[PDB]
Amino acid sequence: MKKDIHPKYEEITASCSCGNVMKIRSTVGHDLNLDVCSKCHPFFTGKQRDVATGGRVDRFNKRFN
Amino acid sequence: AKLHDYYKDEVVKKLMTEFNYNSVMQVPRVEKITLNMGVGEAIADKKLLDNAAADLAAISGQKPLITKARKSVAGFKIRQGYPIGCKVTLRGERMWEFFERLITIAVPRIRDFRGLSAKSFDGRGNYSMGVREQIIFPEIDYDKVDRVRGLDITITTTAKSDEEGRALLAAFDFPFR
Amino acid sequence: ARIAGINIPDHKHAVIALTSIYGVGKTRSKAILAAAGIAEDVKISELSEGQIDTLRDEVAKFVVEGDLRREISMSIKRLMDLGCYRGLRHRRGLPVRGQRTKTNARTRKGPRKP
Amino acid sequence: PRSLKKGPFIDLHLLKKVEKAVESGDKKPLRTWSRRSTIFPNMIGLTIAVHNGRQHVPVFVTDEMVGHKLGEFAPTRTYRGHA
RNA sequence: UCCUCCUAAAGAGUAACGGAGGAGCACGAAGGUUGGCUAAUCCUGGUCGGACAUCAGGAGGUUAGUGCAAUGGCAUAAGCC
RNA sequence: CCAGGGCUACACACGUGCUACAAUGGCGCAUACAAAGAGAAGCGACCUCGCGAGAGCAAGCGGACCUCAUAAAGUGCGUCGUAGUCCGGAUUGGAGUCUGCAACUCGACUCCAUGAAGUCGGAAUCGCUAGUAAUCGUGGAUCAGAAUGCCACGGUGAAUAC
Numbered sequence A: 001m002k003k004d005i006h007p008k009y010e011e012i013t014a015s016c017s018c019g020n021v022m023k024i025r026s027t028v029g030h031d032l033n034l035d036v037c038s039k040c041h042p043f044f045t046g047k048q049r050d051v052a053t054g055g056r057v058d059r060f061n062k063r064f065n
Numbered sequence B: 001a002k003l004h005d006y007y008k009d010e011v012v013k014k015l016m017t018e019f020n021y022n023s024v025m026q027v028p029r030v031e032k033i034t035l036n037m038g039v040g041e042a043i044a045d046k047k048l049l050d051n052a053a054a055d056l057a058a059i060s061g062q063k064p065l066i067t068k069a070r071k072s073v074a075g076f077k078i079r080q081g082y083p084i085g086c087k088v089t090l091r092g093e094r095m096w097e098f099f100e101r102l103i104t105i106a107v108p109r110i111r112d113f114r115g116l117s118a119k120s121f122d123g124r125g126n127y128s129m130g131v132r133e134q135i136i137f138p139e140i141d142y143d144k145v146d147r148v149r150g151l152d153i154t155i156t157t158t159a160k161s162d163e164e165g166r167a168l169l170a171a172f173d174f175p176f177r
Numbered sequence C: 001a002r003i004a005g006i007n008i009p010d011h012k013h014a015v016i017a018l019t020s021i022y023g024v025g026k027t028r029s030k031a032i033l034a035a036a037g038i039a040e041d042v043k044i045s046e047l048s049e050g051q052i053d054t055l056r057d058e059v060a061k062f063v064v065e066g067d068l069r070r071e072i073s074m075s076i077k078r079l080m081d082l083g084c085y086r087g088l089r090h091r092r093g094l095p096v097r098g099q100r101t102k103t104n105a106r107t108r109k110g111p112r113k114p
Numbered sequence D: 001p002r003s004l005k006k007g008p009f010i011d012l013h014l015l016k017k018v019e020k021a022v023e024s025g026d027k028k029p030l031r032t033w034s035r036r037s038t039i040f041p042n043m044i045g046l047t048i049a050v051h052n053g054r055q056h057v058p059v060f061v062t063d064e065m066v067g068h069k070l071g072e073f074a075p076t077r078t079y080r081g082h083a
Numbered sequence E: 001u002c003c004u005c006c007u008a009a010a011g012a013g014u015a016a017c018g019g020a021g022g023a024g025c026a027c028g029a030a031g032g033u034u035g036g037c038u039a040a041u042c043c044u045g046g047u048c049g050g051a052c053a054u055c056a057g058g059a060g061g062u063u064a065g066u067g068c069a070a071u072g073g074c075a076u077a078a079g080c081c
Numbered sequence F: 001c002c003a004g005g006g007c008u009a010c011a012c013a014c015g016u017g018c019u020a021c022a023a024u025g026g027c028g029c030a031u032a033c034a035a036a037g038a039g040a041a042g043c044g045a046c047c048u049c050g051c052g053a054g055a056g057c058a059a060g061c062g063g064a065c066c067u068c069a070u071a072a073a074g075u076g077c078g079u080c081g082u083a084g085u086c087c088g089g090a091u092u093g094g095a096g097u098c099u100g101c102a103a104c105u106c107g108a109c110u111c112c113a114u115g116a117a118g119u120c121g122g123a124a125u126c127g128c129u130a131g132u133a134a135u136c137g138u139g140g141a142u143c144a145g146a147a148u149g150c151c152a153c154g155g156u157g158a159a160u161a162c
Helices: A056-063 B002-016 B047-059 B093-109 B162-170 C014-018 C026-036 C049-060 C065-082 C086-092 D012-024
Strands: A010-015 A021-026 B030-037 B065-068 B083-090 B126-130 B152-157 D030-032 D047-051 D056-060
Touching: A021 B093, B002 B093, B002 B162, B030 B047, B030 B093, B047 B083, B083 B093, B126 B162, B152 B162, C014 C026, C026 C049, C065 C086, D012 D030
Parallel strands: D030 D047
Antiparallel strands: A010 A021, B030 B083, B030 B152, B065 B083, B126 B152, D047 D056
């Protein structure tokens, strides 16, 4: 690489709010806590929960005996 | 980095026991990752260009190169030799660092991830994804706010098919609707 | 500071800045602060991480931005696929609930251009 | 809307004819002037020609439309354009 | 007045109020050298981005380029840095 | 005579009003001051549940006695700190209560979610000389339901007339 024009590039140690630690080399300036990470995520665990696209026979027959 | 090690164990063993292989040079490896930032408004104002270059230096690792317009078209009112876009190419160690940063910390924040497309592939092993907004990379202070300024990433593997590069990216624990 | 939809403007009060998430208005943000026990006087500026994730799980159990966007766009789309009158007024660009359309209903149909 | 302690509404003639056409199985468009009566689960599988004031417009009843009423699928005021 | 093509009849030359186009300049780099590089056009994917700017890959071989008209030429590049 | 539709449509133009564009305000909490009314197939306490619209049981009252009915601005405490904003409440989606055979065309209200134009309005033009204008709330007729209109009642209450 060129020796001056690039900024710093430090290994910083983030901790997800779910708890997982990650030692990654980047250029933030501080160890920053993300809210969600790729572990204990909705879609990476399988928690996407697609809506029932019309349960109108369940709705009606729930409403009326 | 560590996903280079995870590649050299798990991904290469899964691609060995996925396709019929003799040699370890059949199995593809990702050569490079290229960021593009297609600014296009540098014919109007000029400081947006170097601030978008600063955003690419913030998101990626190294400094972006300002690319020039090759063919001049009046339909976008552009001229030969104008600084019209920006690009970074990361290969090797910094590519593996950016790849683990894309997987681990970036795509979790992509604002209603309903599963990104899998028909995106090229025909010779290239993925291409265009983020609508650059916030999802956490390296921004957010206190600076300029514009939207989204970018796009093009990953180039030496795979031949799209089965090949698609299963190779799926070996890297990729979401893939 | 960083919640699943977008950020929170850190200088406002508690319920006032919690409402800025798409998907929760004022009484429901009041229910969130009741569930965390957070008084409304503290702003988001003072809020350390313990109160932040105690806010995060309680707003996670509530319905949030992206799936609500999907639900409203899908329900409108489904009514339009049906063939009813409500979806038909969603197709044309006129109000759906029986408004006066002789002279008013300008918000649904835009500026008074021609 | 109707209160949900009362239940749904269906006119006696419409109910009896729908039950007769479901039992005997013939799926011709039966004609009615009873737009207000709400559809039921019993009513999928039949095109029905409902009144609108001039003609009987036929609707095919599918899965989704069971909560709505019959008059939602027959536009009364036919408007084509001012120019 | 000068330049390029054709008539010009396979050396040069060769007319008409014959058929066609251009010049009265530019550049201290657009010159010299060393080192490097190879086009045009379509196809696919990709944020704004669109027939068409930017990016990545593929077919294809000079159909591209030459400071400026035409002929000859150019890959060892006379093209580009 | 009967069933359904239409009078409620909608590129458009006008009149009359309500509401906002905010700090002389918004919101939360606490607290004070009236008048005129209306009421029998009606008016509905108190009590049980509901965030609620309400529902259930349900005494009193042909009314100076019961019932709607709690008047709100005001007064006091804190925040908001000049932003399309804790201003605005239009539109839309879901969930509901009530009345009536029936709430889709086309009722009203509650609740949750969203938060449109709007930063005082060109050429013009209107009303008003005092408990008046301006601002604030209540009530009644019509009525199964459905007022931002109409008709009243009152609370704070100006400026100017050379």
